[PDB]
């Protein structure tokens, strides 16, 4: 019989990210012409979606789950760059050229940093 | 680990009067620290 | 002589006398009680004169409960004064009583003495009242 006493670090980190993602979400919103680019980051992968918050539907998505990104010989930042290109091409195929960036509550730097500019250079004006 | 705000951490060795030797780090600038009574030396740790 | 130790506001509008009592209409502590039947401000002294009257008749045994507490103040302007120049200083403390309210409750072994004792208390109250017991 083990009764944990304190908060586990995993849930403290999980709750804190949710708390500091809402305060980001006060000003950032998406639209059918300017979809919000939501970023989710994990220790093994990364995920992006184009969300149209008027009706809460996703336009396009990309992630490090796809084996194409997995087969990249590089680093996590190199996988992130490959993801950034992928979402961009899927964005243009859906008819969007300008987005807003929802960094998702993570500090903008490192893997996210590689994600944003890789899509920025690919033609996603934001 | 902030660059300059911290005292310089010196690798040192503990030598005691009983011949016991310990390896650690410390602040002692000499880099070697001596001691007269240690845990082995201390009667309380030996039940004495 | 019951007065509140402190009150947030010392000068207040007169408590209104409309309606009938919604809470405290049934005897809860004792076996007999006095139930009001008309609206009137039962002041601070009338409670004291009535409570003393009960104790004198029941003598030693028994316990008396006073469900009414006079915490609502009333003011009067100083005598021989024209109207105006502000509100008068608070004078006496009253507790607003509506019909159905149970004021006193008395517990005593025998019924006959208890009913007589509560009857004396009624004569010290401005309202027409009746004595009510505990059962249905």
């Amino acid at each position: 019989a083990h009764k944990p006493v304190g908060q586990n670090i995993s849930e403290v980190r999980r709750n804190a990210r949710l708390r500091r993602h809402a305060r980001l979400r006060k000003k950032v919103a998406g639209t059918a012409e300017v979809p919000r680019l939501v970023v989710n980051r994990s220790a093994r992968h990364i995920h992006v979606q184009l969300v149209n918050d008027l009706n809460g539907t996703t336009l396009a998505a990309a992630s490090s789950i796809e084996a194409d990104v997995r087969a990249i010989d590089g680093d996590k930042k190199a996988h992130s760059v490959r993801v950034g290109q992928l979402i961009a091409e899927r964005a243009k195929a859906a008819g969007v050229e300008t987005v807003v960036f929802d960094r998702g509550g993570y500090t903008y730097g490192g893997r996210i940093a590689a994600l944003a500019d890789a899509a920025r250079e690919a033609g996603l004006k934001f | 680990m902030k660059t300059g705000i911290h005292p310089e951490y010196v690798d040192t060795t503990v030598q005691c009067g009983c011949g016991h030797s310990f390896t650690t780090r410390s602040t002692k600038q000499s880099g070697t620290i001596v001691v007269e009574v240690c845990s082995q030396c201390h009667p309380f740790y030996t039940g004495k | 002589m019951l007065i509140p130790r402190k009150v947030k506001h010392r000068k207040q509008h007169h408590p209104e006398q409309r309606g009938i009592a919604s809470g405290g209409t049934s005897v809860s502590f004792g076996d007999y009680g006095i139930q009001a039947l008309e609206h009137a401000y039962i002041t601070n002294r009338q409670i004291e004169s009535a409570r003393i009257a009960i104790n004198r008749h029941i003598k030693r045994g028994g316990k008396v409960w006073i469900n009414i507490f006079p915490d609502r103040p009333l003011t009067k302007k100083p005598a021989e004064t024209r109207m105006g120049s502000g509100k008068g200083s608070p004078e006496w403390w009253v507790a607003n009583v509506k019909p159905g309210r149970v004021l006193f409750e008395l517990s005593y072994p025998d019924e006959k003495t208890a009913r007589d004792a509560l009857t004396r208390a009624i004569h010290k109250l401005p309202i027409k009242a009746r004595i009510v017991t505990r059962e249905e």
Partner: protein, 192 residues
């Protein structure tokens, strides 16, 4: 304790509202409603005199067998509405119960006996909670206080109950408190 249901005749209500209910009272009938596990609210008018008679004899928690337009339904008096001054019965809530059903209700408590001469007996709680079969409900409970001395607390758990009866309320309730009789010195102190 198995009791026989009391028979009453009830008829449905054509119009409901404060206009109709007031007139119904003026006619000597008390409006009522009937709901239960069957999930079927029915509006009935009982005769005031016979309803009063049933309650006076069988207590407030009376088991009834209503006759609603020729149909016999077993019902229990859930609650009443007594006007504070007139002491009428303005409205009654009736709950249908099947035989052998566990129902939670409140019964009264009476203190019977003769306390020691230097003792004042105070009843803190009038009614206690009880779970029992619909027909096994006791009309009232008894507590005996004879030869009890000093400050002795008769709590709810100490009461003896008929078979098949459970004490839903916690035993910590202090139904009866016995203390030393106040003296004239003590009476003329409290309240000042």
């Amino acid at each position: 304790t198995a009791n026989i249901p009391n028979k009453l005749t009830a008829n449905v209500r054509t119009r409901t509202g404060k206009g109709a209910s007031r007139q119904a009272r003026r006619d000597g009938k008390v409006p009522a409603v009937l709901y239960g596990h069957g999930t079927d609210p029915q509006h009935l008018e009982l005769n005031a005199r016979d309803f009063a008679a049933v309650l006076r004899s069988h207590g407030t928690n009376a088991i009834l067998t209503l006759d609603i337009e020729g149909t016999e339904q077993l019902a229990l008096t859930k609650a009443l509405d007594v006007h504070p001054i007139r002491r009428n019965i303005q409205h009654a809530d009736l709950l249908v119960v099947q035989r052998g059903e566990k129902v939670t209700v409140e019964v009264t408590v009476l203190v019977e006996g003769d306390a020691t001469p230097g003792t004042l007996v105070t009843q803190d709680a009038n009614t206690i909670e009880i779970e029992a079969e619909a027909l096994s409900i006791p009309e009232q409970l008894t507590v005996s206080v004879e030869g009890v001395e000093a400050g002795t607390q008769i709590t709810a758990g100490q009461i003896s109950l008929p078979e098949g009866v459970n004490l839903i309320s916690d035993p910590e309730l202090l139904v009866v408190n016995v203390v030393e009789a106040p003296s004239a010195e003590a009476l003329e102190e409290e309240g000042a």
